[PDB]
Amino acid sequence: SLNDKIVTISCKADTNLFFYQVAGNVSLFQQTRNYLERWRLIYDSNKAAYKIKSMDIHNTNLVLTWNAPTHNISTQQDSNADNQYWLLLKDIGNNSFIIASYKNPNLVLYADTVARNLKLSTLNNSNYIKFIIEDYIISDLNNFTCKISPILDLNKVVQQVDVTNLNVNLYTWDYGRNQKWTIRYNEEKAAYQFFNTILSNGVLTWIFSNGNTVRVSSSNDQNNDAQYWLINPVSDTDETYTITNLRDTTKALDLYGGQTANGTAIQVFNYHGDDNQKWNIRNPP
């Protein structure tokens, strides 16, 4: 289930610190939402262990390595060595992982939150040997405040119209809070909500009571699958996604007629994957 997955790894002891890699050096650093903090998990069925390969774009063959006989950790050229393999032991109920050396499982990864780096340690009951492993997309998008633009015009955004009118349309970015949305991932459902930042409880919603109409509505409801969405990356892009609805995944968030004028309706529509169903989720500048 975890083989070949690209993930972020962050510290249970400090969830704002992430495994960070550059030029053979591994350190702990704030969220970057980029490849410096991404790792590919590579499973070997015989060892029953994983390599943890950096997604560095310059040095393409670097993997998390234990610098035996020291307690230091680095990234080195992958040679399939036993000190390049790790046991991913999931602490159930704690949603966290202890990461032990395959070469020597007496030793596990330890977060030095003051030095901001990693070492190997014997075990204990502290959060310093516990790590959070997460799909990099979820990691990047969860609790991210963004604007959403169609790729047919990146100068325009998806907005709630104002605090009292909850309809959703396409407009020129004006930096207003009605044009920002905070994404939150729900683990019980494996799907996301888009909270408009001009309200406390407003979430992007398919009005399945009115065909294809899309509006913001309160989250005060018990459970409505229409409120929740799957966000899927389009290949080769950093920030481009298709957004499908949980209730019915054949329904994709869609810009009416691929029209790019102010006022144009944002609605759901059968997934065809054309340019009008592709969305840029970005930082606000």
Partner: protein, 144 residues
């Protein structure tokens, strides 16, 4: 005839976590327990010159030695190369105790696990050593 930094003879063995807890066997494990004034808390320490290492036997069972087993525990057993110990002296009476031999191609040492400095009922284990600063690997040898 003293050959080294730690004279031959009988010792009590303590963890730096407690001045009142003393190394002795309980079943096949080693642990630190309340003062007994009994021979099973007394340890004969003998230098082996050919090796530059130490053998440590219990006074109550003088042919048993501090050794280690295949499950990570320190043990009491017959003479074997697992009974050789390389101390490193870090303070008055304070030592780190390494197995003479590299284990899993690392230095391994006596290690006592603690819980906010409490070691009651813990077995003494053999775990990896990296430096002289691991509080869990520091032990006192007191002459008496």
């Amino acid at each position: 005839v003293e050959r080294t930094f730690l004279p031959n003879g009988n010792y009590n063995i303590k963890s730096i976590f407690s001045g009142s807890l003393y190394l002795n066997p309980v079943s096949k494990s080693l642990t630190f327990s309340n003062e007994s004034s009994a021979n099973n808390q007394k340890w004969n320490v003998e230098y082996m010159a050919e090796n530059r290492c130490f053998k440590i036997s219990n006074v109550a069972e003088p042919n048993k030695y501090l050794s280690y087993d295949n499950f990570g525990f320190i043990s009491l057993d017959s003479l074997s190369n697992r009974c050789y110990w390389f101390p490193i002296k870090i303070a008055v009476n304070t030592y780190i105790m390494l197995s003479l031999n590299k284990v899993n191609e690392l230095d391994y040492a006596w290690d006592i696990y603690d819980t906010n400095e409490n070691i009651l009922s813990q077995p003494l284990l053999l775990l990896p050593n990296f430096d002289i600063y691991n509080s869990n690997q520091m032990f006192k040898l007191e002459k008496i």
